[PDB]
């Protein structure tokens, strides 16, 4: 067939029940999500392909960048309560990995207060036990297919995207195959 099982995606031997249709996993800390994000705009493309109805989860994962990194989840839980995500996507990438500039929480904060979200308004987030059950879903998601690797693309709980088997000489074409894999998988 053109798409096969263990070339372009696996199957879960323990499909997750009640999964979101399209979960995507990342780190700050981790450099091909940084290329996914600002580079290739995977989520993105895959977003513009896939049919009516199908929403797109992106959860931040801990295993990573030790207690930075679980901040990190945390302050994804805040962008994502307030729905700020794309307000604060590129600074956090860039603040981690390119200028190297967030240290510390505080340092996470700051870009928050940078994009225009209001002090008092991110600490009340950070604090609320609203972020608190959302840093445990992106935890528990995680941890229903025992991730130990992003970034990650998992269809309806039972297919995990596998972009190694994927032409790399083109990223226009290597973005494409792999939004049309998802759609692809999708319609399964």
Known sequence: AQYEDGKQYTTLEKPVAGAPQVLEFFSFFCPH???????????????????????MTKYHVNFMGGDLG?????????????????????????????TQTIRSASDIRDVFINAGIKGEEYDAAWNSFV???????????????????????????????????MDTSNMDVFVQQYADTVKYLSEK
Request: glycine content about 6%.
């Open 131 to 165: 972020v608190k059950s959302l840093v445990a879903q992106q935890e528990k998601a995680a941890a229903d297919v025992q991730l130990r690797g992003v970034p990650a693309m998992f269809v309806n709980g039972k297919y995990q995207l596998n972009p190694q088997g």
């Open 33 to 55: 999500c940084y290329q996914f994000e600002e580079v290739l705009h995977i989520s993105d493309n895959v977003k513009k392909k896939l049919p009516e109805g199908v929403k």
């Open 70 to 98: 679980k901040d990190l989840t945390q302050a994804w839980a805040v962008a994502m309560a307030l729905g700020v995500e794309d307000k604060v996507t590129v600074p956090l990438f860039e603040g981690v990995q390119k």
